[PDB]
A paper describes a structure:
The GH13_37 subfamily is the most recently established α-amylase subfamily. It was created on the basis of the isolation and phylogenetic analysis of a novel α-amylase, designated AmyP, from a marine metagenomic library. The AmyPΔSBD is composed of A, B, and C domains and shares structural features with other GH13 α-amylases.
Substitution of the glutamic acid at position 221 of AmyP with glutamine (E221Q mutation) resulted in nearly complete inactivation of the enzyme. The E221Q mutant displayed 0.125% of the activity of the wild-type (WT) enzyme in thses assays. The crystal structure of the E221Q catalytic domain mutant AmyPΔSBD in complex with maltotriose was obtained through co-crystallization of the E221Q mutant of full-length AmyP with γ-cyclodextrin (γ-CD) (AmyP-E221Q/γ-CD). Peptide sequencing of protein bands from the dissolved crystal sample by sodium dodecyl sulfate polyacrylamide gel electrophoresis (SDS-PAGE) and liquid chromatography-mass spectrometry (LC-MS) showed that partial degradation of the SBD domain of the AmyP-E221Q/γ-CD crystals had occurred. The structure of AmyP-E221Q/γ-CD contains electron density representing a maltotriose molecule bound to the active site and occupying subsites -1, -2 and -3, whereas the structure of AmyP/β-CD contains electron density representing a maltose molecule at subsites -2 and -3. These observations suggested that the E221Q mutant possesses activity for γ-CD and the WT enzyme possesses activity for β-CD at the high concentration in the crystallization drop, thus producing maltotriose from γ-CD and maltose from β-CD, respectively. Stick superposition of the active site of AmyPΔSBD-E221Q complexed with maltotriose on the structures of GTA and TASKA indicated the remainder of the strictly conserved residues for subsites −1 and −2, including residues participating in hydrogen bonding and aromatic stacking interactions. In this work, the resulting glucan in the crystal structures, however, was not the cyclodextrin, but a degradation product, G2 in the case of the WT enzyme and G3 in the case of the active-site mutant.
Residue numbers in the entry: 0 to 496
Amino acid sequence: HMCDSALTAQANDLRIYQVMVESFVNGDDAIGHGTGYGTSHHKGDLQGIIDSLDYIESLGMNAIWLTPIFDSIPVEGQDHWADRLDATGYFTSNYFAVDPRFGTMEQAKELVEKAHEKGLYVFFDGVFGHHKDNVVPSPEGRLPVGENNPVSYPESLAFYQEVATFWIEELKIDGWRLDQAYQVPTEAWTAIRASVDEASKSVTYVNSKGEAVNPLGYMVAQIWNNENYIKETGYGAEGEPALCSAFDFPVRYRVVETFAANENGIGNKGGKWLDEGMNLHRLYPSHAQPNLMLGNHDLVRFGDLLQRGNIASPEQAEYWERHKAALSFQAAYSGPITLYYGEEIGDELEGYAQKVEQDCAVQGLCDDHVARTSANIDGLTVNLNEKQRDLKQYVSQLMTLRAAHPALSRGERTNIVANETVYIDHKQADDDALIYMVSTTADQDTVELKASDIASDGQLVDLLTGKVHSAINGEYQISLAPFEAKFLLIETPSASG
Ligand SMILES: OC[C@H]1O[C@H](O[C@H]2[C@H](O)[C@@H](O)[C@@H](O[C@H]3[C@H](O)[C@@H](O)[C@@H](O)O[C@@H]3CO)O[C@@H]2CO)[C@H](O)[C@@H](O)[C@@H]1O
Ligand SMILES: [Ca+2]
Ligand SMILES: [Ca+2]
């Protein structure tokens, strides 16, 4: 079974806001795990997310992805580590019940229905390769087979097909993020994809515009590895697709290594570094649809990497400029994109920056869960300061801009310049053509652009400020402030491109 081309077209417009449920908004102070991995209140729940949908929608996002919300049943006598694990949802017991520390089944149904009203898709987190030891049998009487971690395929396939279809039929969720997807063999992903596509076409709901639609059936694999492994374990071969979308970890690293440093300190790369990462998409088969995120619940926050690398701090202007540069790269990236909660306000963990190794789990400070900080949602859990609001407004402008210009979400990309100081892409989709330019240097600069090299015949219009740029002797001259990005509409493209 090939990938569905209608879904691929729809997937390019996904602007996904990721929510780690336990550490997000404590909306019902009567329920919650109260322990976990991270420094948050550990009492996030479905009411908190429900209270946050309007905020999320005004960001410009059109989807939410929740970490697993299914029932992780406590085993009598289990140690404190097993209580913390239960709060993550990643080692569950009952795939067919909502964990009562997060809420009820009725509240889940209310969450999805309300998100659908406000114009948001909903994705759940499917862990189909491992589970807690006390896993509970399915409604149709199935159980997964083999070890708890990993389970055996194909014996466990009937069980996980039942999981994947249950929440689509019951709540009409729009798809699945697929945890540690290399644990499930590619053969089985095709079969689970068939069930999801079938389950999704067998139910409908009314979207925010009155239209009755099927749930999307989106599926995106999490494979924390490089391009050859994402290809081998996730996308599959040319002509023989396994999954159709995986997270773009390689380009995520290029971004933070250009505009900050990664968890290991590799940093201060330039525009050439971004461009080489995008060119490595050639290693994927033609059906592959990578999904670019900047961070997630397993990665240190951008803001803390800036501080870790001694690059910038929230008091300094470069800290905010560098956030905007990275977020602008994402907004220009063709394909689905995902934003981890708090990136839109440059969140960081006060008093933390350097890596903490010894005894880090109990302090909530290991690199793989330190981003699970309590959600600062403006108007709900926090009043933002002027710099946080300025960044959130900018993320809104990017997402609104992206929703309006096909060249950003599904454009063909052609690189114009990639050097130590600037990165300039040409994006074209139908007759929407624009130039994306971002500075990768702390110095101000002027960019010379030959009108013929970018297939431009008329003017360039800054899509955010409105400034017209006119060519003189066949050249545009644009000034770039340090780490400043501009989206320039090619107002009258040439005969071809
Ligand atoms: O004490 C051991 C270990 O516990 C914690 O690790 C857990 C993660 O916090 C938890 O989320 C889950 O990890 C999953 C990832 O989040 C998920 O994105 C996927 O890609 O991989 C994991 C499989 O679900 O489970 C791990 C433990 O297995 C804590 O964060 C660690 O520091 C600690 O070492
Ligand atoms: Ca709560
Ligand atoms: Ca910090």
